């Protein structure tokens, strides 16, 4: 059965099995998160680049990160954005299931820069739990916001 913990700290140095990144279409650096997934993983970002709403999978040896493209809510109609946002998730949890690990760490996609400036904590760890929920992962959230630690913390609770 998939368990959540929450970590406050670098999801660049997580302890798990795989990590996904907040990546974006082209593939780039970028910043956040994504940049410190490049800087810890700079050999996963050949040819990363992949659609709004996909993952895709680029092996370091037998480490996989998951490039999880989340749309940029200034891009999108709430609507539409919220559908990219559940779909790449979706092809996540896939990934997961495919790639047979045992844990994954993953950030909050489309949270931030790519936010629009609208608070989208609840939005986002909702499509993660529908996602990761398929999957029989350990599944670990990092974040680096103390209050957003509370947050996710509390919203894992009372799932159970």
């Not at 891009?75 to 790449?88: I, M, Q, T």
């Not at 896939?94 to 949270?111: C, D, F, H």
């Amino acid at each position: 059965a998939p368990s959540y913990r929450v970590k406050r700290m670098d999801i660049a140095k997580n302890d798990e099995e795989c990590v996904v990144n907040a990546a974006n279409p082209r593939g780039l650096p970028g910043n956040g998160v994504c940049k410190a997934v490049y800087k810890k993983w700079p050999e996963s970002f050949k040819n990363s680049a992949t659609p709004v709403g996909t993952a895709k999978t680029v092996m370091c040896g037998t480490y996989p990160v998951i490039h999880a493209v989340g749309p940029n809510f200034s891009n999108y109609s709430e609507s539409e954005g919220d559908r990219e946002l559940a779909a790449a998730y979706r092809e996540v949890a896939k990934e997961v299931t495919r790639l047979g690990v045992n844990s994954v760490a993953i950030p909050l996609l489309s949270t931030g820069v790519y936010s629009g400036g609208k608070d989208r904590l609840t939005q986002s760890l909702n499509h993660l739990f529908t996602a990761m929920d398929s999957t029989d992962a350990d599944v670990v959230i990092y974040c680096r916001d103390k209050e957003w630690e509370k947050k996710i913390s509390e919203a894992i609770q009372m799932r159970t």
